[PDB]
């Protein structure tokens, strides 16, 4: 329970602009998300591609989250040990892009988006430690 607590902790820093906890087994659904941003709009369909078996067009085609187009920098989402995927939003001529990290637990996907100028290495670190935290309550 209390999935909002995890979102609140992830957002306490001020360096992040979006975060969401999404259940992806059977019937994917957003369990907790930042109101009014992009992750709150993820659809079961996009989730299907994330935990998806076909991970080829990822590097050369990217993917989308809550409608937002993204590029894939690294994908170890299913590879054991790491369990995370690092993306960068896709922007227009000169629009600022943002770092995104997706981490997978037993039952959920933890997503985090940083603000402009925040290192990916940091978004990844916070997402990763948060996912580690949830697998302990067997989630």
CATH number for the domain spanning 55: value is 3.30.450.30
Q: Cα 24 to chain center, whole Å?
A: 12
**Token pair 């697998």 in the structure block, residue:** 135
**Structure method:** X-ray
Range of the domain at 29: 1-139
Question: From CA 93, how far away is CA 110, in angstroms rounded?
Answer: 30
| 3-state secondary structure at position 101 | strand
d(CA 110, CA 86): 12
**Domain total in the chain:** 1
Adjacent-strand bridge partners of 68: 65
3-state secondary structure of 13: coil
For the chain, what percentages of helix, strand and coil (3-state, to nearest 5) are there? 30, 30, 40
Residue 98, token pair as written in the block:
């943002």
Resolution for this experimental structure (Å) = 2.0
Environment class of 62 (CB within 10 Å of its CB; exposed 0-12, middle 13-18, buried 19+): middle
Residue 55 CB coordination number (10 Å): 16
């Amino acid at each position: 329970a209390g999935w909002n607590a995890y979102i609140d902790n992830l957002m306490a820093d001020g360096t992040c602009q979006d975060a969401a906890i999404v259940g992806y087994k059977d019937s994917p659904s957003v369990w907790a998300a930042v109101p009014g941003k992009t992750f709150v709009n993820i659809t079961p369909a996009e989730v299907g591609v994330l935990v998806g078996k076909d991970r080829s067009s990822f590097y050369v085609n990217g993917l989308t989250l809550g409608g937002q187009k993204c590029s894939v920098i690294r994908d170890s989402l299913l590879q054991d040990g790491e369990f995370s995927m690092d993306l960068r939003t896709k922007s227009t001529g000169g629009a600022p892009t943002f770092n995104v990290t997706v981490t997978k637990t037993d039952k959920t996907l933890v997503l985090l988006m940083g603000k402009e100028g925040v290192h990916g290495g940091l978004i990844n670190k916070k997402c990763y430690e948060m996912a580690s935290h949830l697998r302990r309550s067997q989630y």
